[PDB]
Design a protein around this ligand. Structure first.
Ligand SMILES: CCCCCCCCCCCCCCCCCC(=O)OC[C@H](COP(=O)([O-])OCC(O)COP(=O)([O-])OC[C@@H](COC(=O)CCCCCCCCCCCCCCCCC)OC(=O)CCCCCCCCCCCCCCCCC)OC(=O)CCCCCCCCCCCCCCCCC
Ligand code: SF4
Lengths: 148, 97, 113
């Protein structure tokens, strides 16, 4: 449990929660909403400290890019945009203002789509930005140091 | 700038000013005609977040004028269009010529 | 002392500004007594003239009288009193306290069209 880093508690559409709130969280719809998440398909994906958290979240966004039906503009264009930005985030190829830009993009996707795939794709990015933001900033700073 | 000292003294005496100190013709003090390439800065709207246009849409803040009274729609002190103009102070730099 | 020049071309300096001001304001009030009581012009002009006349009667110094009047120099104040008196005579002739003479057409002041 000390090696545990993060848990996605309701499948990929629900966002992630770190170990600190994983300590005393229940498996309710209401409890996970209070934990700023949801109980989706009750799929508990566990990631330890060895996990590349940004790579895992970007793989989820790539899954959503591949599985979006493309009918409606916010999900189609925004999920592709989020996938590209998340790939650059995994590489470290961005600057910390792009984290806030990605948050605003996810908020533009969420609630403006036809079905809830847009919400379920914007939520993991929201959870990653909410919890593991210093990790993203560390990646960007390391990339900026080793490339200039 | 190429004038002799006798001609410079004659010009200075005839004009009453030191003409060589303030020459009318530019010789070398001007900037180079070939300049280094610039890098112009960007404005405050050049940000990737918190920059929705509806929060800085000054063109749509214009409203139709408010009707104080109209011929179809519509003890107090006498007022003025503005408080009266304060008198200009005389200049402390050079009040008279 | 006495003012040398008033600074404005064509404006003569007044040797006795207080007496001229008080007779001009008294004449303005007298011509304002002929107006109807409900005339807003009469009410407002009586207020302005009364306050200015009280300031002239209160202050016997020309400089601080000018500072109290805030109408430029006292020659400018005298000229403004003359203009106000002539205006009040014209307003009594014109009678604008009456209701609106004619309403405009419905789209006369509608912008944009
Ligand atoms: C009496 C004064 C006569 C003129 C004179 O000697 O002026 C020189 C000089 C002019 O001073 P300047 O205005 O500072 O000269 C302009 C530049 O500094 C220096 O000018 P610059 O460097 O651009 O070029 C100057 C050059 C310019 O060279 C030429 O103009 C050559 C022309 C050749 C034509 C063929 O040489 C001259 O001007 C030499 C004097 C020529 C005088 C000619 C008089 C006769 C003209 C023809 C009559 C027929 O005179 C003085 O300094 C004092 C004059 C009084 C002395 C007593
Ligand atoms: S939100 Fe739903 S309808 Fe819109 S493109 Fe995405 S999957 Fe299709």
């Amino acid at each position: 449990w000390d090696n545990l880093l993060a848990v996605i508690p309701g499948g990929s559409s629900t966002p992630l929660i770190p170990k600190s709130v994983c300590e005393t969280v229940l498996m309710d719809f209401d409890a996970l909403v209070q934990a700023q998440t949801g109980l989706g398909t009750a799929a508990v994906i566990v990631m330890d400290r060895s996990t590349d958290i940004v790579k895992a979240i970007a793989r989820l966004i790539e899954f959503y890019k591949h599985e979006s039906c493309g009918q409606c503009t916010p999900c189609r264009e925004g999920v592709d945009w989020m996938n590209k930005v998340m790939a650059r985030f995994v590489k470290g190829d961005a600057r910390p203002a792009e984290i806030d830009s990605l948050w605003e993009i996810s908020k533009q996707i969420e609630g403006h789509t036809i079905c809830a795939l847009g919400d379920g794709a914007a939520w993991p990015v929201q959870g990653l930005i909410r919890h593991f933001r210093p990790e993203l900033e560390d990646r960007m700073q390391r990339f900026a140091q080793q490339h200039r | 700038a190429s004038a002799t000292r006798v001609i410079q003294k004659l010009r200075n005496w005839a004009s009453g000013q030191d003409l060589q100190a303030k020459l009318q013709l530019r010789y070398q003090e001007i900037a180079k005609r070939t300049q280094p390439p610039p890098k112009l800065p960007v404005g405050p709207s050049h940000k990737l977040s918190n920059n929705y246009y509806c929060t800085r849409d000054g063109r749509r803040e214009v409203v139709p004028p408010s009707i104080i009274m109209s011929s179809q729609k519509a003890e107090k002190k006498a007022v003025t269009p503005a408080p009266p103009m304060k008198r200009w102070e005389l200049s402390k730099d050079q009040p008279y010529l | 002392l006495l003012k040398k020049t008033t600074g404005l071309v064509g404006l003569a300096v007044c040797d006795t500004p207080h007496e001229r001001l008080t007779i001009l304001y008294t004449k303005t009030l007298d011509i304002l007594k002929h107006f109807p009581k409900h005339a807003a012009y009469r009410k407002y002009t009586e207020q302005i003239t009364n306050e200015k006349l009280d300031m002239v009667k209160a202050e016997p110094d020309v400089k601080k009288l000018e500072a109290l009047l805030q109408g430029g120099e006292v020659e400018e104040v005298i000229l403004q009193a003359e203009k106000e008196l002539s205006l009040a005579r014209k307003m009594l002739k014109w009678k604008p306290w009456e209701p609106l003479v004619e309403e405009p057409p419905a789209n006369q002041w509608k912008w944009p069209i």
